[PDB]
Amino acid sequence: GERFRIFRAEKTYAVKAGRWYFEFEAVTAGDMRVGWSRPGCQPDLELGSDDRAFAFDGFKAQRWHQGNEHYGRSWQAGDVVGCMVDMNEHTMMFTLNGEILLDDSGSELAFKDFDVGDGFIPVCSLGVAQVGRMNFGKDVSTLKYFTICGLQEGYEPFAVNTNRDITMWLSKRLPQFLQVPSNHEHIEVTRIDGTIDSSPCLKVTQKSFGSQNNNTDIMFYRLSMPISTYYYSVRIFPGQEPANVWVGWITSDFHQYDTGFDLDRVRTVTVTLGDEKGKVHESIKRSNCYMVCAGESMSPGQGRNNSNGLEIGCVVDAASGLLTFIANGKELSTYYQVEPSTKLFPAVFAQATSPVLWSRMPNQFLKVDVSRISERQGWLVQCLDPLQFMSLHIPEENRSV
């Protein structure tokens, strides 16, 4: 189900009228689901599932718009889908190698009757081990089947007028850390205004999180906090211990996501800089990416339901290596003697039923890459060329956007 990458384009040169030609060179037979979509949303979802995106596959020999809608014939290696927009009548079509694919109704037509909205830009999709070719055509000779139907009817290449190379986006491989949620499926955070003579959590806010029903796959919390010391608390799921989930302080170095957790979870970093072979010195055990304490068998006496060693949310007066997270009700026997490291928006691992670390951000790479040179008799690399790009970094959380 995963591993699909929708190779989007920059939304700056979106369309609102006219017509253009577009072909996708297919090398690997099977799943070559390509087409176009609005900028919109759903950067990680089924391509062409709704009317927002339009695509046509060859493995299932069907299009993709508001359903499957079996259309056309299966393709193979060395094929061009041949997509052209038609915004003066809002009727889409495809020509497989210059031949229009016959639809389910026998009218060799793809789609009709949609609103222009923000327009659509070409979108590909490659599931697993699929080789494709994103080609719009700076010149007529760049494309091969462009002179079959698009040229004779009045369709132009997508880069006919642009004097610069057209850059394309692609799906990310790692989930972004904060990713503040707005209108997800079952994501909803609440805040309260209790400030005095109440709120024993002392956060002066709720930060309560509750799912709808029967939907959980162990996901890593990431909430927004725009507004010992610093007595606050994050309203994690109230201590019902669905799986004895693990709570701890997460670092900015964390980039790894899977269903399982509480594993080795990247290198632990244990440094004993000194003389080593001669005589070791004071150790330096830095924190992990998932430097999160395990839930363990908290409250062995089976106490109250919604109170089992959680949401301590406190920090000591001075940075003495360890903070007020080695506590949470009792002793858990951890040290956490680390460097200053970082401090940013709160995030604590959690997974509960009803008794966001999401990878849905498109990314675009550089138009011009550094030149790599290979040789023989040693495979010596000879690189002599400058290439720099400036990046805004670390507003509050360390990043490079």
Binding site: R3, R5, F7, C124, L126, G127, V128, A129, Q130, V131, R133, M134, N135, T142, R173, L174, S252, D253, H255, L263, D264, V266, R267, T268, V269, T270, V271, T272, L273, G274, E276, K277, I284, R286, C289, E339, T342, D369, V370, S371, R372, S374, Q377, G378, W379, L380, V381, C383, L384, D385, P386, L387, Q388, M390, S391, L392, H393, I394, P395, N398
Partner: protein, 218 residues
């Protein structure tokens, strides 16, 4: 009546708090898949040493990237720079400043990446200690619990103005030095029945004009 406000708004929040910026690029890796663990596989001893011919600064800036990191696969995600792989310190002249973590020391027999780089790489899957012998006293400071699942890659990274030749066992070339007892050279891990070459840092996009390849996750 503006100079007081202009000179007051400058130390307000313009000291260093807002969006800073810098510019550089890097990254480079070899192809051979080590991928050794328990079971139907091989042992866990290896040795690396490289050769340097041309290292100059000031091509674009004083900082020219040339680092060899501990964990190429688990240290950092390619999605900044190989060698300085966040947790990995990155092998360089005399530094051990990892990605956003500083752990550098002043061990003897230290200098910049100068000619005749008589170096030694230490690996141990049982307990990843370090003995980085460079003409005598080695670099100290261990880094344990590395490459847990498997699929380890020794990598060499460069940014610009670098002319070096790969030296991993010298199967295609010539191994200048010899492995000590224990740590054997990198002659092994070269899988037969297939061609040996050099690939990218898990990168599918390279220098192209109009025939750009579009590869899926692999």
């Amino acid at each position: 009546n503006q100079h007081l406000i202009c000179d007051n708004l400058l130390p307000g929040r313009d000291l260093l708090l807002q969006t800073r910026l810098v510019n550089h690029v890097s990254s480079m890796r070899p192809n051979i898949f080590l991928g050794v663990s328990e079971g139907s596989a091989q042992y866990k001893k290896w040795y690396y040493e490289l050769m340097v011919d041309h290292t100059e600064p000031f091509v674009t800036a004083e900082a020219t990237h040339l680092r060899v990191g501990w964990a190429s696969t688990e240290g950092y995600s390619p999605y900044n720079g190989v060698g300085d792989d966040l947790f990995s310190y990155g092998f360089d002249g005399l530094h051990l400043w990892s990605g956003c973590i500083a752990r550098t020391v002043s061990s003897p027999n230290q200098h910049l990446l100068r000619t005749d780089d008589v170096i030694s790489c230490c690996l141990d899957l049982s307990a990843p200690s370090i003995s980085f012998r460079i003409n005598g006293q080695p670099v100290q400071g261990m880094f344990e619990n590395f490459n847990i699942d498997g699929l380890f890659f020794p990598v060499v990274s460069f940014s610009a103005g670098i002319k070096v030749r790969f030296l991993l066992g010298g199967r295609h070339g010539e191994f200048k030095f010899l492995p000590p007892p224990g740590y054997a050279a990198c002659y092994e891990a070269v899988l037969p029945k297939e061609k040996l070459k050099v690939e990218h840092s898990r990168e599918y996009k390279q220098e192209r004009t109009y025939t750009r390849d579009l590869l899926g996750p692999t």
